[PDB]
Amino acid sequence: TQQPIVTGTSVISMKYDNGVIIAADNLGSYGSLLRFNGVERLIPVGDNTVVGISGDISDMQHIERLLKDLVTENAYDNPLADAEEALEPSYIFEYLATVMYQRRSKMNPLWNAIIVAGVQSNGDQFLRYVNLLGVTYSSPTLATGFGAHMANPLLRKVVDRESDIPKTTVQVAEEAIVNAMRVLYYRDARSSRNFSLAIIDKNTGLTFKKNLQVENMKWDFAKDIKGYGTQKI
Amino acid sequence: GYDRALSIFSPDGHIFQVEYALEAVKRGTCAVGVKGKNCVVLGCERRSTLKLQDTRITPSKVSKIDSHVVLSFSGLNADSRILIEKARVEAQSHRLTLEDPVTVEYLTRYVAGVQQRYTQSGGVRPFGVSTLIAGFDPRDDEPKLYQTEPSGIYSSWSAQTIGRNSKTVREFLEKNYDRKEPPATVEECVKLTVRSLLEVVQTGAKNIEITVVKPDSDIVALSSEEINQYVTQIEQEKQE
Amino acid sequence: DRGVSTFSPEGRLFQVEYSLEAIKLGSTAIGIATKEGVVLGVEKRATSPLLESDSIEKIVEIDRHIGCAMSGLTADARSMIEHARTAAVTHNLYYDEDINVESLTQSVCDLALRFGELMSRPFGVALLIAGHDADDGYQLFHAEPSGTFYRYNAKAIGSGSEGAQAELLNEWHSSLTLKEAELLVLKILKQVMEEKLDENNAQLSCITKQDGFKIYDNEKTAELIKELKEKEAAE
Amino acid sequence: NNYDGDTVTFSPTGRLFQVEYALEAIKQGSVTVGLRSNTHAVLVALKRNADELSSYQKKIIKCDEHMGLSLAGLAPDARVLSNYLRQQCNYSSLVFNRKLAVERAGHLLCDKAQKNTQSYGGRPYGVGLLIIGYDKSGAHLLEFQPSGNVTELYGTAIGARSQGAKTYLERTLDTFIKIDGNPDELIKAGVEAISQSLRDESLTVDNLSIAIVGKDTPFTIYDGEAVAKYI
Amino acid sequence: TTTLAFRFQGGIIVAVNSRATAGNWVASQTVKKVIEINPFLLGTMAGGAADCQFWETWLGSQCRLHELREKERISVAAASKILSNLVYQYKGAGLSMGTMICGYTRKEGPTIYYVDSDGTRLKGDIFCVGSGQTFAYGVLDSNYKWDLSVEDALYLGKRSILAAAHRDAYSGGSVNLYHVTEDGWIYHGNHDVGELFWKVKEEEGSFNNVIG
Amino acid sequence: QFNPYGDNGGTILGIAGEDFAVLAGDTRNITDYSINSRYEPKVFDCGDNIVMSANGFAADGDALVKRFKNSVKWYHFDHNDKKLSINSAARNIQHLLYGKRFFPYYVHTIIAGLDEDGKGAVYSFDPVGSYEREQCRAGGAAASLIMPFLDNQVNFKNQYEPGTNGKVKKPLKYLSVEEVIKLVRDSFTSATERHIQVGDGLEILIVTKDGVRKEFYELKRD
Amino acid sequence: GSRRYDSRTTIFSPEGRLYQVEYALESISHAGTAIGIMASDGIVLAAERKVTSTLLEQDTSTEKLYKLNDKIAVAVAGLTADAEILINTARIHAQNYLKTYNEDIPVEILVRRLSDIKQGYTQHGGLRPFGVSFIYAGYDDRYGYQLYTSNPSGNYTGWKAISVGANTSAAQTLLQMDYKDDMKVDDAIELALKTLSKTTDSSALTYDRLEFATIRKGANDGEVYQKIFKPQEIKDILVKTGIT
Amino acid sequence: MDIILGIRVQDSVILASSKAVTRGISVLKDSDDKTRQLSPHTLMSFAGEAGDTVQFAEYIQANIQLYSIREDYELSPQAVSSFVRQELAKSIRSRRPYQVNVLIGGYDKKKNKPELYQIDYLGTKVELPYGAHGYSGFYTFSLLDHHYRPDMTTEEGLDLLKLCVQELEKRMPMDFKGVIVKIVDKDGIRQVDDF
C-alpha cells in the first residue's frame, strides 16, 4: 500500500504510417506544488524503444534502473546484442507488464501508468499501455491521466481506426501531438509548458527531442472577459 | 542436521545395517504368539540372570496399544518404546478421525511403515526390534496375529515366535500347531504357548509371561501361580 | 566409506547397481500383455508353513485401470504405491479423467533417483506396472530403481527372471488370448519356483478395460492350475 | 584411484574423475547424431531396447515449439535437464514474450551442470545432449557434455561408436550445410551419418528416431511408420 | 438454495433444487447440487457454489484413496468427518458451505450427516439446508412419518422442495431426486418446477393462493 | 487505500450447437467513462480446439488465460501430447480459479469447444471456480440484458405451441451456425444500444472439428 | 567432505550391538560404585566417591547424589558433566508435569522420559551417547517406594536392590545374598555400606569417600522426606554399623 | 449450545446439558449430547462457539485416553481438569482461541469423592458444589443457593435439578428442548433416559 508523492502527469502517444510518436512534459509535481522542472519522463531503451512513464517519480526512477539493467543483462554472452538478439519493444513491455502485475498482486504496486512506444525488428509499430494494476491495452492512440480525457479525442480525429494509420504522416501526427500538449497546458493544472517528444521511425530511427515549448497560444480574448455575469467594467 | 546414509546396499545386494538389526532381535529374549479359535495368546521369555528385580514396576514385555490390541517384541528394549509410543498415538488419532478403533492389520501396517522409514532415512539406524502384534478388530471375533521386523516387512501368522532360540520353538510349533483345528479354548491355547516356551526357557518360574487377549477389548495378564499351574501340569504329562 | 551417489569407473551408480542385486534375490513376478488384457502373477514364497499366505500382498491396485506387481525388498514398494495412488487420484481431480499408464509409471520413476546426501538410498524393489488407457491401450511397464522404465509385451522379474524371460521370449505372440496368458504365467511360475506351485503360494491378477483391475481368488486360480496340468499331459 | 571418491576432489594431474566416469556413461549409451543446414536442424537417434519383448528407449525430447534435444547416457538425467530447459524456454516466453535463444539454452545447461561438479554430496549428470533449434539467428546445433562444456557445431554425434558418424559428417560438411529448404534431404544425410556407427544391426522401423526443426517447421519428432521413408 | 434429505423405513431420500443466484440475479436454473461421490455416497451443496463444488469433489478423491489403502468402502461417519475437519482448518477464512453427507454402509445402515462451514457436524434423520430450508421443513415435518412408502417418500421430498421453490425467491429451477438403499443410490430424475407446480396444483388441489 | 481490482467492462457470449460452438465478445476496453481501446481482443484460441474468455478485470483475465494456455502446454509434455478434452480443461480451470479463492480473479470465465462425442460444449465459471456445462451463457457487463433473450431464443423458454392452450412447449432443437451468429449479432447490437460499456466491435470465434474460425463485425462507437 | 571423519556413533556391529553404548558401559564400569536398596519403609542410596584427595572440599560437594524433586533422587555413575545435563532436563520435566496436572510426577514417567532421551542419542543425531548410568530412588502414591536404573542404551529396569559403576558383579552377588523383602531402612543402610566396604578398591572405607542418602516416610504423618547425608552424619552412621 | 449445568452431591456428580442445536431461525436438532467421556470416571460437558466445542472436547478426550493406555492408569478428575485448563489457557492467547466453556464432573476413586470443576474459555478453573455456564447461571445459582445441601443423595440431586430445568423452561427466552442428564459416581458414568 502506497501513496504517490512526486508525480508526473499525462503521457500521450500515437501511431503513424512509419512509426510511433510519444510525448510527456518535464514536470515533477509535489501535490499542488510544481516542484521539479527538469524531469525527463521519456526513457529510451536501445535505438528502437521509448518508455513514457507517468505517476510516482521515485517508482519511475526504479523502472529506469530496471530497463538500464535489462540492456546490460541482454548483452551478456550475446554476440548479436546489437543485431538479431537486441531488445524489442514487445520484450521490454512484457517484462514491465509482468513486474507491474506481480507488484499489484503483492499489494505493493509501482504507482505508475506506462506507455511503451517503439518499432519492432520487422518494422511493425508497437504501442501498448500498462499501469499499476497490471492492466494492459493497445490502441492507435494511447494516453495517460488527463491525456486520456483530452488528448485521445484530438488524436483519434486523426487516427480513428487501424486503417487511418497508413494515411497519417509523421508531420500530421507530430502536429496533433504538439497541439494536444498545448491543450493539456491550458486545462491540466499539474502540467508544464516545457516537454519532450520522441519519434521512433522504422526508416530514420529514434529521434529524441528535448526542451520543446508550448507555443501559439490563445490568450488575447481574456481581456474582453469582465466579471462573472452582470458586471460591465 | 545429521544426514549420513547409514542403511545402504552392499555389493552382494544386502543392507547390512538392517541385517545387523536382525542380529539384535536374535539376541533378544524369546517371544511367542499363538492364536486359537476365539483368542490370541502372547508368551514372553524373561531371562533369569536378573534376580533382585521389582516385577511390579519393571516394564512389562507385552504392551497395550489400545484396549483391543497388544504388542510384544524381541530385540532392543529402548527401541521398542519408541514404536509403542508412535503406535499408541496413531491408535488415538485413528479413533479421532475415523470414529472407529484401528484394525490389527492397520496398526501393524503403521508400525511396519515406521520401521521401514528408518531403513532409508538419512542420519538414523534401523530399529533393532521385531514385534508380534495381536488382537481383535472392532465388532469382530476372528483372532489376529501379525509379525513385523526391522526391514519393514510384515505378515500374518497362525502361530509365530521371535527372539533367541526362536528357531527351536518355531520347530516345535510347526509340528504341534494344526491349521485345520487350532486351540479350541483359552486353556488349550495358553498350554501350547507355555509348552513351546518350555522347549527353550530353562525353568517355568518367573521366566515366563503370558497375556491372553479375547474379543471386545478383553485383555488380561496371567499371574505367576496361574502360569505355574500350566508348567506343573505339562511336566507331569511329559514323564511318560 | 564412499558417497551414495558415486559413479563407478565403468559409468554406473554403485548404489543403483547394488539395488539390482537385491531385486535378483526377490521372489519371481511375471507380467504378460495381450489385446484382451494384461495378466500379472507372482510367487508368494512363504518363509514358513505357519505364515498365512493370503496376507502376502505382492500384487496391488493403484487405480481401477492400473495394477502393480513387485519383487525385491517389498517393504520399499509401500511408499511407491502410495505415491502412485495419490498421483492417479490427484490427476483425476485436476483433469476429470483417468491417467495414462505411462504418465503414472513416469511419476513413480521420478522418485527412484531422488536419493543421496531426499531419501538415503535407492529403492530395493522392482515393479511391474500393468494397466489400460484409451490412447495406448493395454500396457505393461517395468519400473526399476535406476529411474528407468521399459514397456514390455511380457516381462519376468526376480530370482528366476533370466530363465523365465527366455521362456517368455519363445511363448509370447501378438494374438495371445487372456486365458492363454493366464496359463502361461502359471506355467512359467511353476518352472522357476522352488516349491511346488499351487493356489496358496502363487497369485494371479489381471486388468481389463471392462472390469478393471482384479486380483483372482484362490478358488479361481486353483481351477486354472488344474486346467494347466491337464493341457500339458494332453500331448 | 584415491581421487575418484567424489566430484569435489582433484587428482594430482588436475583431473575430475567423477566427471570423467560420468562422461564414460555417455560412451556406453546408444548413438545419436545431430546436424544442420542454414534453414533446418536435424536430430537422428538410434534407439535401444532391453530385448525383443521390450520397447525402444525414447532418445528425443521436445523443449519448445522451436527447440529440443536428443540424449545419450542416463535417461532420467536427460529428463531433469530437458525439464529445466522447458521451464527456461517457458520463462522467456511468459516474461519477455521472447523465444529463448539456442545459445542461451546452452549457457543455462552449462551452468546447471557445473554446479553439480563443484559441490559435495551431489554428482555430475550422467548424460550427453544434442540440442537443436531455430531462433532469430537461424538454425543451431549444440553438444552438451556433463562436464559443463557446451559447443556449437554444424554437425556431431555422441554415444557408442559415434566416431564413425562424426568422421562422416566431417567429410560431408560442405555438402549437407547447403541443404537449404529441403527437410527430407537433410534427414537422409543424417540417417546416412548414423549408419556409419552401426555394427551387425541395421536401421529398422521401430529402431530409428528422427526429429527436425526449421524456418517454417516446428520441432516435431518422427517415430514408427513415419520414419519408414528413410530406410 | 433449498436442499433436504431424510431417513425412513426404506432408506434415504435426498432432494435439492437447481437455482444459483448472484444477489437478485438468477444466474442458473440447472445446477447439480448433489455430488455423486461413490455408488453408496452422496453430498448436498448449499451456500458458496465453488466452495461446495470444489471441496466435495475433493472429498470423493479422499474417499477413493481410503478404499485403495484399506480395501474397504469408507463409512459415512469417516467421510463426513474428513470434510468437517477440512472446513474447520479454514474456519474464519470465509468459506460458506452447508452440506449433507448421505449414504449407506453395512455397519452404519442408512446415515445422514449435516456438515457446515463453521465446523458443525451432526448426525440426524431429517435435515433441510439452504435459504428456503424453513419452507421445506414446514411441509416435510407436517407430512413426515417413518412408515412412509418409497413412492410417498420420494413425493414428499419433491413436494417439500417445490414448496420452498415457490415461496423462497432464491430457490427454484428444478428438483433433483435421489433414493439411497442398502444396494446404493438411485437417481429419480430432474423435475422442472415450471411444469411440476401446475401439475401438483391441479392433481393435489393445493396452492390456492395462486391464481389458477 | 490501494484497490487492486478494476472494471474493464465488456461482455461475452457462448453458444453451443450440435457439432459446433461459438464464443463471442465485444472488443471494447474501458475504465470508468473512458475508452481505452476500441479493439482489444479478449477471446482466445488456447489450443486443442478450446476457446476461452475471462471477462471483467482485464489484468486478472489475461493472467488466467495465460496460465491456462500454459497448462495446456504442460499437459502435452507430461501426457505424451494427449489432447486436452473440454471437460478436462474445465476442471483444470476450476483449480486455477479456486487456487486464488482468498484473493480471486475478478472475472467471469467461459470456454467453448467440442466434447469427446464431437458435440458442441460451453462451460461457464464464476470468479472462484464453480463451473457448469450449458447450451447458452452470457457473461460480463451486459449479461443481464443478453441472457434472458438467449433463454427465449436458444432454449425456447416461455414459448408454447400455438393453439395447444399453453400445454405443449415449443420443442427444443439445435440451431445452425448461421442462426446462432444471427442471435449473437442481435444480442450485441441490442446490448450496445442500452449499455454504455458495450460497443466498438464484435469478435466471434467459431469452433468445429475442422478448427477455429474467426468473424468480426463493427458495433456502434458511442 | 566431512564423511571422512565421522565415527558413526549410532550404528550396529555385525553381532547386533551398539558399539558406542558398549564402550560407554565400559567407561561406566571404572566409575565409583553406587548402590540402591529399596526397603518396605524407605530407600537407601549409597555411592563411593572417586579416589578422593585430602584437600578436596567434602561438605560443599556433590558428585554422586542429586535431587530431582522433593520425592525423587538419583545416584550417578559415569561422567558427572553428562549427568548434570540430564539431571537439569529431568528437573524441568518434573516441573512441567506438576504445572500441567497439579500433581507430583510419578517416578516411572520421569525415568521413562529421561531414558527416552538417552535412547535418542543411540538411534539418531550422530552424537556420542551420555556416558552415564543412573539409579533412581523415589516415591509416589501409586507404587510407593521404587528403585530404577537407566544406562546409555536408554533401557531402564526396576529393582529391589541394585548396584551401578565398578564391581557391580561382586556387589550384586553380595546384595542378592543378604537382601530380603521384609527389610527395614536401617537394615538396608547397613547392607549398602557393608557391600561397598567389601567391593571397594580402596584400602578402607571412610566417611570422606562416600555420599549417602535416604528417602523415608519418617516425616510426620503420611509424607516423604529426602535426607542427603552430611559428612558428619556419614561419619556417625559408619561408626554405628561398626565399619570404622 | 447454551445450557449446561452441574451439581455435585454426596456420592456423585450430575451433569445436565441442553439438547437443542440451533442455527439461525431453525432448531436443527433436539437430541444433541453435549458431553464426552474422558475416562471411565470422568465426564466433560461443553458449550460455546459452533465447531470449536466438539473439536476441543474430542481433542481432550483423545489426550486423556492416550494417557490411560500409556500408564495403564486413570487420571484423577483434578489432574484432568488442570490439563484441560492449561489447554484453554494456551488457547486464549493463540491466533484463534477455542471459544468453549466446560464442566468436568468426575469421581475420584482414590479419595472416594465426587468432584465438579467449572472452566470457562479463558482457562478460569473453579471447583464447585454446583456450576453452570452461560445465562443458565443467572437463574440456577440463586435457586441452588437456596435449595442445595451438601449431604444430598443422587435422587435428591435429580429433584433439585428438575427444579432448575423447570425454572429455565419458564423464564428463558429460547427453547432449549430439555436436557440430557448423566450421573458420575464410584460405578462410573450412566445416563438418565427419562427426564
Ligand SMILES: *[C@@](C)(CO)[C@](*)(O)[C@H](CC(C)C)NC(=O)[C@H](Cc1ccccc1)NC(=O)[C@H](CC(C)C)NC(=O)[C@H](CCc1ccccc1)NC(=O)CN1CCOCC1
Ligand atoms: C441457493 C440457490 C441460494 O442461496 C444456494 O444456497 C446456492 C448453492 C448452490 C448454487 C451450490 N448458493 C448460491 O447460489 C450462491 C449464493 C452465494 C453467492 C455469493 C456468495 C456466497 C453464496 N451463489 C454463488 O456462489 C454464485 C454462483 C454463481 C451464480 C455461479 N457465485 C457468486 O456469487 C460469485 C462468487 C461468490 C464468491 C464467493 C466467495 C468469494 C468470492 C466470490 N460472485 C460473483 O459472480 C460476483 N458478481 C456476480 C455478478 O457479476 C459480477 C460479479
Ligand SMILES: [Mg+2]
Ligand atoms: Mg454503447
